[PDB]
Amino acid sequence: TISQAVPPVRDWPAVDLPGSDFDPVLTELMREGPVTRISLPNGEGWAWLVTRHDDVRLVTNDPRFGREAVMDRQVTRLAPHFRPARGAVGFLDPPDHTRLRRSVAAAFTARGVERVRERSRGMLDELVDAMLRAGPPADLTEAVLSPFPIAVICELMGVPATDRHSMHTWTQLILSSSHGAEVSERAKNEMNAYFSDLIGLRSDSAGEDVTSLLGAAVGRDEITLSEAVGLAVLLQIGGEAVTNNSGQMFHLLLSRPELAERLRSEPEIRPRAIDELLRWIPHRNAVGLSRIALEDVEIKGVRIRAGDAVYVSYLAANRDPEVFPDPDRIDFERSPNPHVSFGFGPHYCPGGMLARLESELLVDAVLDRVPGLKLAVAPEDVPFKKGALIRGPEALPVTWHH
Ligand code: HEM
Secondary structure (H helix, E strand, O other), rough: OOOOOOEEEEOOOOOOOOOOOOOHHHHHHHHOOOEEEEOOOEOOOOEEEEHHHHHHHHHHHOOOEOOHHHOOOEEEOOOOOOOOOOOOOOHHHOHHHHHHHHHHHHHHHHHHHHHHHHHHHHHHHHHHHHHHHHHEEEEHHHHHHHHHHHHHHHHHHHOHHHHHHHHHHHHHHHOOOOOOHHHHHHHHHHHHHHHHHHHOOOOOOOOOOHHHHHHHHHOOOOOOHHHHHHHHHHHOOOHHHHHOOOHHHHHHHOOOOOHHHHHHHHHHHHHHHHHHHHHHHHHHHHOOOOEHHHHHHHHOOEEEEOEEEEEOOOHHHHHOOOOOOOOOOOOOOOOOOOOOOOOOOOOOOOOHHHHHHHHHHHHHHHHHOOOOOOOOOOOHOEEOOOOOOOOOOOOOEEOOOO
């Protein structure tokens, strides 16, 4: 009937945001309408953006949107660099995506990750023992939040004990140290070779650790060795997400003492509280990886054309006022909490249950074992990551009673 003009293309420059402050450009986009168009610093052209919870679920779960097609051009994006390997799980669609996710799914369910909870709680107690022994102050990130997710994933992956410190080092060197280009990709090569060998060796394993599952799937020709190794590396270095996210968690718990006080007074609410924190924390800068409309799709009266790129903002979806009344309020009692901090659809985060487990153990040890714990700097003086994809502290200086 009546033409509905397309939205203006909104430029979305890379900006370093303080602490956990919400992106005001994303707020602007949320206020503009459910369907907007954006231009990011890198790649070319524009992309659709959806911000409402229902539209985000549609775009991420509907078969009419595809990931492989994203590598057919230079879609506008935040990251300077793009498309490493084209076997990367992120860029696969259900001809092949499903095989790869299925091969390890069992280790990452609630029941799957529960298998490493006691060992993980022990490893965390070791780290905290050491921090207490050294005495205050400490950088909680360096002392605890950084090493713990790596220890846990080593255990879940089934890395032989004598190789786990090599794993730590490799993980630290990969894309997150200094010595750009060279040491990172050499560490990546070593880790690749390592997992190629371990998974290869486990070609007929009935083990239930992740590398055994990968090895067995490779052995039954469900996936190739190359696919298995790539995924193994992604999973192995994925814990940095928990390091960053839990860093924001404790930054919040310490800068807003009432939250910490609630979790000490009512320990029973900690799982729900963690979910609320996961909902609220602005985990990333801007948006991540788009999907291509494989056929024309109408969203809120807007015609998304086949070939167009479409982004979702999980961050925005987690502040959807209809789904989350008073969305900017951190409410640990929040009634239903259907957040999409771990994404949605086939590409939903494999590590979500693992991240909740890690966060629950972390909150327990840090809130229960550090007497008089507080920030050692003003909240606004905690350094947060600049030029980042995933937001979070560079360091989290804390102090307490020795
Ligand atoms: C609280 C911490 C974490 C958060 C907030 C998080 C969030 C996310 C999000 C938003 C996505 C994208 C979903 C999409 O493409 O639509 C994702 C993907 C992914 N995450 Fe995480 N993640 C976390 C921890 C982890 C950990 C610890 C691991 C490693 C076990 C991991 C492994 C992955 C993988 C492999 C993918 C790609 C999945 C696929 O495309 O099939 N994540 N994550």
